[PDB]
Amino acid sequence: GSKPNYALKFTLAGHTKAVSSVKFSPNGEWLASSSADKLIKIWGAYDGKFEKTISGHKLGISDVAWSSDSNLLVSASDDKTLKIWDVSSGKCLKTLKGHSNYVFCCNFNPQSNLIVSGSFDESVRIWDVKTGKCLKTLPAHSDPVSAVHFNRDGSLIVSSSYDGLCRIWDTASGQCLKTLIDDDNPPVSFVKFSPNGKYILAATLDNTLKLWDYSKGKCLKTYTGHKNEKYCIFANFSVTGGKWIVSGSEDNLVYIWNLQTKEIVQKLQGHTDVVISTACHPTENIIASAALENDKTIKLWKSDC
Ligand SMILES: O=C(NCCCCc1ncc(CO)[nH]1)OCc1ccccc1
């Protein structure tokens, strides 16, 4: 139908501190969760079946991301490292050392030969997956880096920071192509490219999401009605059914907007803390949501539309 009807199917309990992020494997079979409890957990995407725990970080994890082939994870930790994991064995393949403060955010490129990382140390780093070596250090921002994402062909990196900037980097050279948002405030708490790489979805800590045309460098859409003044809350493009924007909120709800109309089409109620992270299943109308330390659970929601 014209609107989604997401309904709770499973609650996934196990993390002992705040959940930090959830991501669906590109092949659709798994959900990965990261937590302040220093653990990665793997769950069945369709039945919420707990699969395994992946251990090794010495401090809390802020982010976890999947390789294109669904075989590897990368995690970003307060221990100042990233770890590349073999999902099948649960083994740490590489520890990426270089950041001088907490690593907050990470992603593979589509090729999954590189990792990008953002840190409290105000830098973005680009890592070789095979060797685990740092290839480039970008002096990207003047405050913690909130998010990092590659575009569809891997040629660009978008970064955001508490410095109030969103910047787009040339992957090959590490040089800045443009500063898309250039305000002193508010903090830009999240950014990512649209699936086709033409747009950037950006969250600011004034309870606002915006969709930007990258090439033109102007705002096409604004989404409001949720609460976001404190946390780096993820936002998603939902594309399997109706074309939505999905975001957690500091009022403990998941918000779903019509992308084109900007109307709120659903609020998912159930979490008992801030919903820090949502993910959209790659083929099914399924949302995963995760909450901070008063809740510590992941919820799987399913919609007919
Ligand atoms: O949002 C949080 N922590 C909650 C868990 C991590 C959530 C997260 N990881 C990656 C993303 C988006 O790329 N979002 O910290 C905000 C903060 C910042 C600076 C000083 C105090 C507090």
Swiss-Prot record:
PROSITE patterns: WD_REPEATS_1, WD_REPEATS_2, WD_REPEATS_REGION. The modification N6-acetyllysine is found at residue 83. Changing residue 104 to D: Strongly reduced affinity for histone H3. Pfam families: Beta-prop_WDR5. GO terms for molecular function: histone binding; histone H3K4 methyltransferase activity; histone H3K4me1 reader activity; histone H3Q5ser reader activity. It is found in: Nucleus. One of its GO terms (biological process) is positive regulation of gluconeogenesis. Its main location: nucleus. Changing residue 18 to E: Strongly reduced affinity for histone H3. Belongs to the WD repeat WDR5/wds family. This is WD repeat-containing protein 5.
